[PDB]
Amino acid sequence: SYCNCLCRRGVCRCICTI
């Protein structure tokens, strides 16, 4: 339903949910 893939301040957590 959504995709949250990005980085910032070391919070680089590339993922992707429905």
Backbone as a printed PyTorch tensor [residue, N CA C, xyz], in Angstrom:
tensor([[[ 0.8270, -1.2010,  0.0000],
         [ 0.0000,  0.0000,  0.0000],
         [ 0.8650,  1.2560,  0.0000]],

        [[ 2.1490,  1.0820,  0.2950],
         [ 3.0830,  2.2020,  0.3310],
         [ 4.5260,  1.7060,  0.3290]],

        [[ 5.4480,  2.5920, -0.0350],
         [ 6.8640,  2.2490, -0.0800],
         [ 7.7100,  3.3430,  0.5650]],

        [[ 8.3710,  3.0000,  1.6660],
         [ 9.2140,  3.9520,  2.3800],
         [10.6870,  3.5780,  2.2500]],

        [[11.3390,  4.1120,  1.2210],
         [12.7510,  3.8350,  0.9810],
         [13.5390,  5.1310,  0.8170]],

        [[14.3070,  5.4850,  1.8410],
         [15.1110,  6.7010,  1.8080],
         [16.1250,  6.7130,  2.9480]],

        [[16.9220,  7.7740,  3.0130],
         [17.9340,  7.9110,  4.0550],
         [17.9620,  9.3340,  4.6020]],

        [[18.4720,  9.4830,  5.8210],
         [18.5560, 10.7920,  6.4590],
         [19.1470, 10.6760,  7.8610]],

        [[20.2010, 11.4440,  8.1190],
         [20.8600, 11.4270,  9.4180],
         [21.3410, 10.0200,  9.7640]],

        [[21.4630,  9.1750,  8.7460],
         [21.9140,  7.8120,  8.9630],
         [20.7620,  6.8300,  9.0670]],

        [[19.5490,  7.3210,  8.8430],
         [18.3590,  6.4780,  8.9120],
         [18.0090,  5.9060,  7.5430]],

        [[19.0150,  5.3800,  6.8530],
         [18.8160,  4.8000,  5.5310],
         [18.1850,  3.4150,  5.6350]],

        [[16.8610,  3.3640,  5.5400],
         [16.1360,  2.1010,  5.6240],
         [15.2500,  1.9010,  4.3980]],

        [[15.8610,  1.4850,  3.2930],
         [15.1290,  1.2570,  2.0550],
         [14.1960,  0.0580,  2.1880]],

        [[12.8950,  0.3130,  2.0840],
         [11.8980, -0.7450,  2.1920],
         [10.7080, -0.4730,  1.2810]],

        [[ 9.6630, -1.2800,  1.4230],
         [ 8.4590, -1.1280,  0.6140],
         [ 7.3420, -2.0360,  1.1220]],

        [[ 6.2830, -1.4250,  1.6440],
         [ 5.1490, -2.1760,  2.1650],
         [ 3.9240, -2.0120,  1.2730]],

        [[ 2.8970, -2.8170,  1.5300],
         [ 1.6670, -2.7580,  0.7500],
         [ 0.7430, -1.6610,  1.2660]]])
